[model samples]
Target: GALSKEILEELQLNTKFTEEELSSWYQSFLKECPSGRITRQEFQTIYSKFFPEADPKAYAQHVFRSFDANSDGTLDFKEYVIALHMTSAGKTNQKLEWAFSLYDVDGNGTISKNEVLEIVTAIFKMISPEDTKHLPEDENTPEKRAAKIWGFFGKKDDDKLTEKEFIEGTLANKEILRLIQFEPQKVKEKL
Candidate 1:
């Protein structure tokens, strides 16, 4: 069955997907997950299949955590679609908004150093070490790189980053944004 008009309208308001695109995404999602939802374990397994060179366990956990809106333990199809939009197709600001939510795991309005570190470290682990090895010594390690990125937000007297500060700071600094960019496997193969 197609998505109800209410669902289509609601998603259209929040996402970049067109009506037709949304319907196709729903069909694709249903094909992969007949249950209409995906558990964290299933998400991790599917995600890991895309990155065989690296251990994506921790990264997948964090991503699944971020994607599971409503604080539920699983991702419903709508959540999956929104995540795909935020990570892959959304504008820079839209992507940063999702990143803010991802880093602000505690759901507080502000993001802290520890918060960024946790996610960035997981992200680094997911990347191939071979690709990381060629970077400058200071940037080669996850801790160091995470620290460098955090430095941008911690420039103020406070150690915490309010949402406005994060979005604005990250937008102005291309390098920091690139550092934290969460590039999931392209949906081309799956869709």
Candidate 2:
């Protein structure tokens, strides 16, 4: 239900793997691990074989290190899911939930376009001061800049977002959305 055909097509094009071959690779990965949980060291060992020029250890460590919130040295299911979601979609459900909770200010269970824009703009300023050069300048400093940024999203004034928009906009593109929805297990079954 979550796998986006667009993402799958992109991956297939980039890897140049036929669906059959890709299915095989997916099965092989599961066959080796079976637990469905991949550790940084294990992921590195496997990834290195495919992309020798890249440092899998560093890449794997960066992902695991950032997502291991408890520092338990392993990514539990939730941590792993969130990590995959953020890395794939450029956002995470946690981010979306936070934005919805904070910006919905009125507790109406829905954020207006203006509200969404305002929150996003404020967040942008906090995260990217250097990027402020691209934003409009105003006497109110942060609020003014934030308002301008918010206007960009409010260009279409319907004001109410469907649940899909709220989640996708905040969480962005998450690879886990694709992986879990696709059910690599199903692919393995065919093998």
lDDT value, residue 115 of candidate 1 = 80
Model 2 residue 50 CA deviation in Å: 41
**For candidate 2, which ten residues in a row score worst on lDDT?**
178-187
Per-model TM-score, in order, reads 0.83, 0.29
Clashing pairs in 2: 88-173, 88-175, 89-173, 89-174
- Model 2, span 1-191: residue lDDT tens: 22245535644543344565545544664576566467778655644664454334443444455566576777644455444443333323334553344455444677666655544343332322334444324412435533443443343555665445556643444322221111112212222
What tens-digit string does per-residue lDDT give for candidate 1 at 149-180? 88866654357787888888778997677666
* lDDT of each candidate versus the true structure: 0.74, 0.44
Best by lDDT: 1
CA RMSD, predictions in order: 4.3, 13.9
Show the lowest summed lDDT stretch of 10 residues, model 1. Answer: 182-191
Whole-model lDDT, model 1: 0.74
After TM-score superposition, the amount by which residue 90's alpha carbon in candidate 1 deviates from its true location, in angstroms, is 4.1
